[PDB]
């Protein structure tokens, strides 16, 4: 049966079910004050397909001017086309070779650049603000989106929204890389998944997909979501309090000193975006310093809800494109005030 929602993460994360249900806000805002993220199911099934494909991205843009990312070691590709990042989207065999002559893990870095989304992309701009939930807090002026309506005591996030586009994590090797690693924001944000590319080629990578979700600590639940094989999954995250912040820089402090970094003792291992907590990490937190986080997989369709504060990280299971944008909820701003 149909149902407004049901719970993830043993009854600690909120699964809305129905994106544009009118009510959402009543069940949404308790778990939103308690500095909770919320999961909302089904987007997709709102948007236009054809304009979320990587083939139309790179038939209409294929010739802008990037930079992208390799994210086993961190090395930029610079100065390339576009299409070099789409094409060997799914197709393993169009994938730009490292040294070693593997295809690479890449991220396409900061495209479309800076605010230009809305300019370059009106069309998809429309189809996402459209169909964003709880547009009382997300859309630019929702009531209860303050982004707007702050003066200069307060950080504004820029004009969104921003695109995440990259491909999957494949080897064991690679269970211990972040697509995006550990950070937080200062505002709130959403980030919808709108398309997931499972290869072909050399695409036998599922095997070790199925061993990444259990070892990245997702429920039961989760893996009943995972096993039924009914949705195709994206990213798996892992989201930390906002009132972890500093205990998590302590242990990354610890680590990076054991490690023979030579750091000032105030440095700040979040801001550096510098580090992804792996299985040994994860559980040297929990053990150690007594945090619990959230571990949170990000199916096609499925809107992450993510708080000021909270730092966070991201490990592509298979390529993703993701677009997200930020928002100021009431319930959040002393996060982004710039005194005391
Ligand atoms: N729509 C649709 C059909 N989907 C094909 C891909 N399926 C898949 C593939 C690999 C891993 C996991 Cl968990 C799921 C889900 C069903
Ligand atoms: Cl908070
Ligand atoms: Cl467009
Ligand atoms: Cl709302
Ligand atoms: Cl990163
Ligand atoms: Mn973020």
Not at 11 to 20: K, V, W
Not at 209 to 233: F, M, N, Q
Request: proline share 6%; net charge negative; aromatic share 10%.
């Amino acid at each position: 049966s149909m149902t407004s929602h049901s719970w993830l993460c043993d009854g600690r994360l909120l699964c809305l079910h129905d994106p544009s249900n009118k009510n959402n806000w009543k069940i949404f805002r308790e778990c939103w004050k308690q500095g909770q993220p919320v999961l909302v199911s089904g987007v997709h099934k709102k948007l236009k397909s054809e304009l979320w494909k990587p083939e139309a991205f790179s038939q209409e843009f294929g010739d802008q001017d990037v930079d992208l990312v390799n994210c086993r070691n961190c090395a930029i590709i610079s100065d390339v086309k576009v299409r070099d990042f789409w094409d060997g989207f799914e197709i393993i065999c169009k994938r730009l070779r490292s040294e070693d002559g593997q295809p690479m893990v890449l991220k396409l870095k900061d495209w479309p650049p800076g605010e230009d989304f809305r300019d370059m992309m009106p069309t998809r701009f429309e189809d996402l603000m459209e169909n964003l939930p709880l547009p009382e807090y997300t859309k630019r002026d929702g009531r209860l989106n303050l982004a707007s309506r702050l003066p200069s005591y307060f950080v504004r996030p820029d004009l969104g929204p921003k695109m995440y586009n990259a491909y999957g994590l494949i080897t064991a090797e690679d269970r211990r890389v972040g697509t995006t690693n550990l950070h937080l924001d200062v505002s709130d944000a959403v980030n919808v998944m709108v398309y997931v590319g499972i290869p072909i080629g050399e695409g036998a990578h599922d095997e070790e997909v199925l061993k990444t979700i259990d070892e990245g600590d997702a429920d039961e639940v989760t893996k009943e979501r995972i096993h039924d094989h009914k949705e195709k999954p994206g990213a798996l995250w892992h989201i930390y309090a906002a009132k972890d912040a500093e205990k998590i820089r302590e242990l990354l402090r610890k680590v990076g000193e054991e490690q023979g970094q030579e750091n000032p003792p105030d440095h700040d291992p979040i801001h550096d975006q510098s580090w992804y907590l792996d299985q040994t990490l994860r559980k040297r937190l929990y053990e150690e310093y007594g945090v619990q986080g959230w571990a949170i997989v990000q199916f096609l369709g499925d809107a992450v809800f993510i708080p000021a504060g909270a730092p966070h990280q991201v490990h592509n299971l298979y390529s993703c494109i993701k677009v997200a944008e930020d928002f100021v909820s009431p319930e959040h701003v002393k996060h982004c005030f710039r005194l005391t």
